[PDB]
From Swiss-Prot:
Function: Catalyzes the transfer of a single N-acetylglucosamine from UDP-GlcNAc to a serine or threonine residue in cytoplasmic and nuclear proteins resulting in their modification with a beta-linked N-acetylglucosamine (O-GlcNAc). Glycosylates a large and diverse number of proteins including histone H2B, AKT1, AMPK, ATG4B, CAPRIN1, EZH2, FNIP1, GSDMD, KRT7, LMNA, LMNB1, LMNB2, RPTOR, HOXA1, PFKL, KMT2E/MLL5, MAPT/TAU, TET2, RBL2, RET, NOD2 and HCFC1. Can regulate their cellular processes via cross-talk between glycosylation and phosphorylation or by affecting proteolytic processing.
Protein name: UDP-N-acetylglucosamine--peptide N-acetylglucosaminyltransferase 110 kDa subunit
Residues of the full protein shown: 323 to 1038 of 1046
Post-translational modification: Ubiquitinated by the SCF(FBXO31) complex, leading to its proteasomal degradation.
Residue(s) carrying Phosphotyrosine: 651
Modulation of this protein's activity: Subject to product inhibition by UDP.
Keywords from the UniProt entry: Acetylation, Apoptosis, Biological rhythms, Cell membrane, Cell projection, Chromatin regulator, Cytoplasm, Disease variant, Glycoprotein, Glycosyltransferase, Host-virus interaction, Intellectual disability, Lipid-binding, Membrane, Mitochondrion, Nucleus, Phosphoprotein, Repeat, TPR repeat, Transferase, Ubl conjugation, Ubl conjugation pathway
Molecular-function annotations in GO: acetylglucosaminyltransferase activity; chromatin DNA binding; phosphatidylinositol-3,4,5-trisphosphate binding; protein O-acetylglucosaminyltransferase activity
Length: 700
């Protein structure tokens, strides 16, 4: 029997599908004023307050909802979601498990439990619960799409084509119904969705920020019109949660320090607390101003602080990644706001004006896949700090064993001083002033192999510190993470990783999720045409190794053909790429950071540009490098380019020597030049705004 609060609850549900979130709340509260013990009203209001970002208040109502109706398993699950968003993963987990125990048929709680496992790296546990969620409720888009990504992570390609079909049809059905797509924006790059579908996904998620900032009811910020208060300097704000030991900092850590202090005032806004790593230290020490916004939880106060600093250009280095606080940009504290480096896709949001890319990564004919206006960097938008982080890899030496450049390698700052102590050093000449010192198989060379084979940490030859490449973390942990430059000479051998000392080593150090059945087949074709070659992958994660292997067997590859290695420390991982001959890039989603890593080791990378931003980064890196012959227009050209490198040893030598020189000569790894080119682009943006114009494309 309907009461007076029961009709208000019905009316408030209508205001929820109307989008009128604010009026929905008022009607819920009026219902609770009539009926204090209305469990549904408490649950519903809390579900609305949760959207608004009023978590602590929503949580309060979820408690009441449960005290009234203890069998409200639906209220338990939603309280967990709230707690989960409040970083109380422990308490959130309890809510899901309690909900499941009250109602073992309640599918949503099973999904939410799987989500906790997924976020915590427990992929098989996530998969297991997602299947349970799906077995209870077969029409469960959230559970299906999340499971799909879990299967993607560990290379479970069971019914892959059928699955890709359902993923697309799910997003299609949801977009047509104006509902939030179950595919996350950062995952849309992995599925054969429409270019339009992906942008629409980014849009829906962008609008979730608008809901969380409309509750603040903040007036639009008044933005600067000149550089008067800034003393003629452009105030650029870099917003990231990755100031520390994170891939982002590994690329751009030098950049703030290289800005021109006569025209630019750098503001680094950290969304994460100090992790003590040297990456955080460098940025803090070199940026004109470092602001820790992790100690400013409220997006309102945070955005105020940004506006109070007088930022002209605010840079989003997160997009839709972990740790992002896009509500800051939704509040628009700056007149110009651009995406950069961090997120390999469009934000799809109104509050984002430009997207810093390049002609290669985002050609002008596919600008319709972005919501933002393109802002081309000259050569490539991608940058890496490898020049600064690993200067010990700038020059190498080898050891002979009767002459290759990837069997046994020595790197070190004092390497050339060490080679002068050795009697019979042969100097092999490269071509297109460069040289590669070779050590003959003598008592000193045998002493090094001894150290490697024995598994010793390090040895001492002529007073020099000769280190084992596998034990860098036991010698200098700072040097292993790339926080410092190794102060010893490091030995890197193929024997260390189980690599055959006479085979064409094809490597790919990307996370295994970037591989799809199409790519593995493409790689198998290459391996079959190059009989004495191996594919070198990483246990990233390790559970995906049996799957990748199994599919390789089914394509006709013996087990020995693919060699796996564990994930290494940052310094080791970059350095050990020297051991490979050719790097096979993943066409579905290019190796972005990992691509810069293999190129710094002087290893040629073969790529095939797709249509998505993520699938075109490697190509952009290679064009800037100066190696257009490592780019393929289709699958056939990909396999061909690779096979040629593994069969034509002279051609391989030329290309390897090409990468080895053009990693230094080209502007690919030049952080100073990059920063200046970035500065030039910044001014083009500001001048356009100061002219009174609205954001528009930038093609130099
Ligand atoms: C698809 C995607 O989201 N790409 C983003 C990702 O790059 P990318 O997709 O290249 O990178 P990942 O997040 O996989 O992590 C790569 C990191 O792993 C490290 N590693 C790898 C294997 C190893 O054995 N040891 C080791 O140290 C690499 O050194 C690198 O630092 O982050 C970059 C920096 O935020 C962004 O520019 C890219 O847009």
């Amino acid at each position: 029997c309907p009461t007076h609060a029961d009709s208000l609850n019905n009316l408030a549900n209508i205001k929820r599908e109307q989008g009128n979130i604010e009026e929905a709340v008022r009607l819920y509260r009026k219902a609770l004023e009539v009926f204090p013990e209305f469990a549904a009203a408490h649950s519903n209001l809390a579900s609305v307050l949760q959207q608004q970002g009023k978590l602590q208040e929503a949580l309060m109502h979820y408690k009441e909802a449960i005290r009234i109706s203890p069998t409200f398993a639906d209220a338990y699950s939603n309280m967990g979601n709230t707690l989960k968003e409040m970083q109380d993963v422990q308490g959130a987990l309890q809510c899901y498990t309690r909900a499941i125990q009250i109602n073992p048929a309640f599918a949503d709680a099973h999904s939410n439990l799987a989500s906790i496992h997924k976020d915590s790296g427990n992929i098989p546990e996530a998969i297991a619960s997602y299947r349970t969620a799906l077995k209870l409720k077969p029409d469960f888009p959230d559970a299906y799409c999340n499971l799909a990504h879990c299967l993607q992570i560990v290379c479970d390609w069971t019914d892959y084509d059928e699955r890709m079909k359902k993923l697309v049809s799910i997003v299609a059905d949801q977009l047509e119904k104006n509902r939030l797509p179950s595919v996350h924006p950062h995952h849309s790059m992995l599925y054969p969705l429409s270019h339009g579908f992906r942008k629409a996904i980014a849009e829906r998620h962008g609008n979730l920020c608008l809901d969380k900032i409309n509750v603040l009811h903040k007036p639009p910020y008044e933005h600067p019109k000149d550089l008067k208060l800034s003393d003629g300097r452009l105030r650029v704000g870099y917003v990231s949660s990755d100031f520390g030991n994170h891939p982002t900092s590994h690329l751009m850590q030098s950049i703030p320090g290289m800005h021109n202090p006569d025209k630019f005032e750098v503001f680094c806004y950290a969304l994460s607390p100090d992790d003590g790593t040297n990456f955080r230290v460098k940025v803090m020490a070199e940026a004109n101003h470092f602001i820790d916004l992790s100690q400013i939880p409220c997006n309102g106060k945070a955005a105020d602080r940004i506006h109070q600093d007088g930022i002209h250009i605010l840079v989003n280095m997160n997009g839709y990644t972990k740790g992002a606080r896009n509500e800051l940009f939704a509040l628009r504290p700056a007149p110009i706001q651009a995406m950069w480096l961090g997120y390999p896709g469009t934000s799809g949001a109104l509050f984002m004006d430009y997207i810093i890319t390049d002609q290669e990564t985002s050609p002008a004919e596919v600008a319709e896949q972005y919501s933002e206006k393109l802002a081309y960097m000259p050569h490539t938008f991608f940058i890496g700090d490898h020049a600064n982080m690993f200067p010990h890899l700038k020059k190498k030496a080898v050891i002979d064993f009767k002459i290759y450049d990837n069997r046994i390698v020595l790197n070190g700052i004092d390497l050339k001083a060490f080679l002068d102590s050795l009697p019979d050093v042969k100097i092999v000449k490269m071509k297109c002033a460069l040289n590669m010192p070779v050590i003959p198989m003598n008592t000193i060379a045998e002493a090094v192999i001894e150290m490697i084979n024995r598994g010793q940490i390090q040895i001492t030859i002529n007073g020099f510190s000769i280190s084992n490449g596998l034990a860098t973390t036991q010698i200098n942990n700072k040097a292993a993470t790339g926080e410092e430059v190794p102060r010893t000479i490091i030995v890197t051998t193929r024997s260390q990783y189980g690599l055959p000392e006479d085979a064409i080593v094809y490597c790919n150090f990307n996370q295994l999720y970037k591989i799809d059945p199409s790519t593995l087949q493409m790689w198998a074709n290459i391996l079959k045409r190059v009989p004495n070659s191996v594919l070198w992958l990483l246990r990233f994660p390790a559970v995906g190794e049996p799957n990748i292997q199994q599919y390789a067997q089914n394509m006709g590859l013996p087990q020995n053909r693919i060699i796996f290695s564990p994930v290494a420390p940052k310094e080791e991982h970059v350095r050990r790429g020297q051991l490979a001959d050719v790097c096979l890039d993943t066409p579905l989603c290019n190796g972005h950071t990992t691509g810069m890593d293999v190129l710094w080791a002087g290893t040629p990378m073969v790529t095939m540009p797709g249509e998505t931003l993520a699938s075109r980064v490697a190509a952009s890196q290679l064009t800037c490098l100066g190696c257009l012959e490592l780019i393929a227009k289709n699958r056939q050209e990909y396999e061909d380019i690779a096979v040629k490198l593994g069969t034509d040893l002279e051609y391989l030598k030329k290309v390897r020597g090409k990468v080895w020189k053009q990693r230094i000569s080209s502007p690919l790894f030049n952080t100073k030049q990059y920063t200046m080119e970035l500065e030039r682009l910044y001014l083009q943006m500001w001048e356009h705004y100061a002219a009174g114009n609205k954001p528009d494309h930038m093609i130099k």
